[PDB]
């Protein structure tokens with residue numbers, strides 16, 4: 001039918017040892033370490049990585065006494081970089097620290113002498129939330145599948161089923177969709193790409209078989225895979241050099257992997273290494289929570305929420321709701337529903353979503369959205 | 385009318401001295417320096433900045449002999465950081481260099497022994513292009529206005545009309561729109577935010593007046609400003625500490641400022657510091673060129689183009705065209721038009737858009753899209 005308007009859409013994800021993701025995990029491990037001692041820590045920790053080097057850079061004002069060497073090295077250990085053969089080793093890498101206090105000019109307008117409920121936005125910016133009824137967790141299939149493919153390789157690396165696997169990995173999933181009055185419905189997998197760092201002992205043919213049979217067929221529902229699905233498995237033919245040795249990594253360079261995989265929209269701000277006063281994080285989280293709550297209320301099938309802030313001002317400047325033609329109520333009526341049911345000041349968001357809890361390292365690989373353990377993934381019951 | 389579905393939409397931009405943008409400009413100045421000597425330079429230059437420090441990090445394989453100290457210091461000079469009073473000085477800062485050759489495992493699959501036309505994609509990834517008929521340059525008004533507000537402050541800083549202005553600035557523009565069968569039409573400016581670093585001699589009241597009268601009223605068409613427009617001008621009340629001293633900066637952390645300001649979509653990849661073999665850049669540029677050419681052909685009013693790649697493979701894995709209900713031809717018919725009129729292999733894109741030319745530092749502030757001098761902004765005449 002013409003109404004089905006068949007289309008392709010692609011998303012990617014990366015694994016725990018991808019150098020950009022190493023940085024996000026380290027930045028969030030530093031955040032967590034601070035929050036365990038000082039729940040009101042002001043943290044803006046950037047991490048940069050390259051061969052043999054982790055650099056911490058940014059601004060922290062906190063009463064915590066944090067051993068940055070240990071936090072960094074424990075994180076790299078967890079990811080799996082523990083020997084020179086792998087290109088990176090937690091035991092023997094350089095950890096360099098260039099951390100200062102938060103600017104007093106920022107402190108004075110954001111939080112100094114303020115009541116927590118009316119804490120100012122930590123910066124200006126725009127943030128989006130997105131939800132789709134296409135999966136139970138209200139996320140695009142493309143991004144969820146991409147994440148799970150990386151998680152599966154990590155699981156098989158750690159169990160020793162595929163002991164040639166190294167931590168740096170990338171995946172990409174192209175799904176063929178149909179549409180239904182603005183809603184989207186996955187039909188089949190059009191193309192899958194997987195690139196993963198590996199040892200020098202395993203053959204290409206063996207790696208390719210394992211990637212199809214033990215990774216892809218374990219993760220992707222069988223109904224979506226068919227004879228015409230295209231597989232680009234270890235397309236480079238060789239990925240021995242990997243991690244920070246293959247590619248310099250930086251915090252906040254996987255913004256789209258972290259969120260919706262190309263769906264919805266993004267305001268530009270990174271999540272990792274930032275406490276709740278940074279609306280780049282807290283408001284993006286709340287926006288996701290709003291979007292998901294609207295879908296789970298049965299008020300729409302798909303929705304994009306935009307919010308924005310000025311530095312030092314608690315109240316959002318603007319909130320906008322876009323439902324892709326999938327709501328019976330108007331977008332203006334839904335904005336009234338959101339105003340009646342949510343308070344998107346960061347000092348209220350912190351309460352609703354428990355954002356001083358040291359769970360941030362868990363968010364920094366495999367996506368900040370879609371996973372059931374995070375508070376912004378528990379829909380709020382709406383009155384309307 | 386119900387059809388007009390009035391809504392708010394917000395975009396931001398930043399100035400030349402914003403620390404993230406300093407990094408993009410430096411990464412692209414390094415790229416340009418290489419290309420002037422070696423048109424086929426392989427460059428993946430990340431820059432990090434913080435108080436007193438510029439760190440270059442990443443991978444370069446090139447026959448060029450580049451003086452990184454001079455390239456960095458000239459760039460910081462140009463931006464305007466030339467004295468300790470400003471928080472940063474090109475003469476006296478630290479420049480640290482951690483640059484290695486490109487991974488041979490990447491080299492061997494991307495370009496080694498290949499014919500230029502069939503050069504492989506430098507990585508996997510997804511990229512979007514976007515165009516809208518709402519302005520002549522086919523860009524959202526929100527983002528164009530945000531860019532111009534920063535450019536205006538830079539102009540007045542350099543001319544000495546407003547000599548208290550320093551290089552680090554941020555702007556944010558919320559426009560009230562109506563819609564027309566999927567197209568969008570700006571009606572009025574709802575909210576403007578401007579924060580700009582300044583000296584210790586100027587009063588807040590004087591800065592606020594100058595920002596409204598000499599910056600905003602000079603840039604925003606008078607018809608869009610009215611008595612109810614909200615102005616958040618120097619909302620922090622004090623922005624003396626700025627640049628890398630106020631906030632650590634990193635290359636590729638202004639991805640949304642660089643592109644469409646929240647409109648369209650983003651695939652996640654940074655532009656700055658990368659040669660054309662990196663499809664994060666070349667394919668995003670070509671995607672913009674495709675989108676703009678479709679609007680300028682009169683085939684749609686608004687359009688989003690997605691393309692994607694696997695590392696080492698020249699041909700895009702998938703191309704998708706979304707017209708928001710604004711095309712008479714189907715999205716499938718338009719994809720046929722795009723296939724007949726464009727070749728989105730990076731080794732053809734490089735030819736069409738002249739991507740070995742050292743013009744990249746010019747792209748690294750004020751947006752990569754919308755400005756008439758870049759080849760991807762000259763629409764291609766379509767046969768259909």
Ligand SMILES: C[S@@+](CC[C@H](N)C(=O)[O-])C[C@H]1O[C@@H](n2cnc3c(N)ncnc32)[C@H](O)[C@@H]1O
Nearest residue numbers: 018195236238239246247428443486489490507
């Ligand atoms: C291809 S590298 C990006 C470009 C790189 N900076 C360069 O110098 O060309 C980006 C990501 O791809 C993955 N990668 C690194 N080496 C690879 C290889 N040999 N084959 C496939 N993927 C690789 C890693 O996850 C890495 O972080």
Ligand SMILES: C[S@@+](CC[C@H](N)C(=O)[O-])C[C@H]1O[C@@H](n2cnc3c(N)ncnc32)[C@H](O)[C@@H]1O
Nearest residue numbers: 044059102105106123402579620622623630631
């Ligand atoms: C507010 S800082 C980001 C948060 C920061 N890392 C912190 O520690 O809280 C982000 C950007 O806002 C701008 N900025 C820095 N100081 C500011 C101030 N005092 N008032 C308004 N904007 C400022 C700069 O352009 C800076 O790069």
Ligand code: NA
Nearest residue numbers: 151152154155
């Ligand atoms: Na896992």
Ligand code: NA
Nearest residue numbers: 203204205206
């Ligand atoms: Na073999």
Ligand code: NA
Nearest residue numbers: 535536538539
């Ligand atoms: Na200018």
Ligand code: NA
Nearest residue numbers: 587588589590
């Ligand atoms: Na005064």
